[PDB]
Copies of this chain bind each other. A is one copy, B any other.
Amino acid sequence: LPQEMRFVDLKSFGGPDVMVIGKRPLPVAGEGEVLVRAEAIGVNRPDIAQRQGSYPPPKDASPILGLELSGEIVGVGPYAVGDKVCGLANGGAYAEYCLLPAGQILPFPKGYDAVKAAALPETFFTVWANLFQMAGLTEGESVLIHGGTSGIGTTAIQLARAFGAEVYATAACERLGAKRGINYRSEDFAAVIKAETGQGVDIILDMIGAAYFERNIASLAKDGCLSIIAFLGGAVAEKVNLSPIMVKRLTVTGSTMRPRTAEEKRAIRDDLLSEVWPLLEAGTVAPVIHKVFAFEDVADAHRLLEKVMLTV
């Protein structure tokens, strides 16, 4: 193992340019952690937010940009060295080596690239936890996904399709499994949903938030769930009628990934390996990569994101 490793560091808060390839020691690896030498690293929306200083990283985790990687175990703590694995990192993934808690590690699925496997954790944990665990998606139910050409979007669509749901999306999408790709700009998605479904859709996975709040609420069937996952359309909704929530017993909820517990993340790792790994291995479901950048070019990658990946 080297002395120092290259990591992505910031000159301040910016600004793609605020980022620069710095240098410092290698993480240790304590109780139920593993050390991984990175071959590939995911780039995700929360990373921009941090490079901006806009969002804090949680205080019990690495302050280095992070979340997702794949590569080779190169150390264990109190799985085996040379094992190839990908996982959800509590931050610090934007480095040549990065820890992982044993509850958050997964094997490369058979036949995957480094890049493909590192494209999995952030997006699959998120969809799995919100759309399957919390929302209890099952066969025959109907789902509407905003942000369909997103990393999360494309993952939600494929997995919703694969489990026998009827699928609609806002944003390619039909190719992935949507019954119907819905152009937001020109069609009214509430109107479309009313036309296509009986009395609305059972589940909405929402990355948009405020701007679509009133339309999401109107699109849901009796006993439907709105699961809010991000706030690309703002967090604050103006002059909004609560009443359909009561009238139709809607449930409105949401969750974020980073603050989720050690046990909660491990539970999600388990379902993924049990329920989804088989589909990835059969080629039923695959991640979708827009482009791959060299690790040095991290600035370019961010710039593009306004699934994009980094080669070490």
Contact = CB atoms under 8 A, between A and B. Distances in A.
B252 A251 contact: yes
Contact of A249 (B213, B240, B247, B255): B255
A253 B242 contact: no
A135 to B, nearest CB: 11
A256 to B, nearest CB: 5
Interface stretch (A85-93, A175-183, A228-236): A228-236
A253 B255 contact: no
A245 interface: yes
A57 interface: no
A243 interface: yes
A123 to B, nearest CB: 17
A157 to B, nearest CB: 21
B239 A237 contact: yes
A16 interface: no
A255 B251 contact: no
Contacts of A200: none
A73 to B, nearest CB: 32
Interface string A224-268: 000011110001111111110111011111111001000000000
B245 A241 contact: no
Contacts of A209: 242-243, 246
Residue with the greatest number of chain B CB neighbours at <10 A, chosen from A229, A238, A243, A259: A243
A38 B228 CA distance: 49
A127 interface: no
B236 A240 contact: yes
A310 interface: no
A228 B247 CA distance: 10
Contacts of A210: 240, 242
A235 B231 contact: no
Contact of A253 (B238, B252, B259): B252
A228 B246 CA distance: 6
Contact of A245 (B228, B230, B250, B259): B228
Nearest to A255: B249
Nearest to A247: B256
A242 B216 CA distance: 13
Interface of A: 134, 209-210, 213, 228-231, 235-243, 245-247, 249-256, 259
Q: Which 9 pairs between the two chains have the least Cβ-Cβ distance?
A: A246-B254, A235-B243, A237-B240, A252-B252, A249-B255, A251-B253, A245-B254, A228-B246, A236-B241
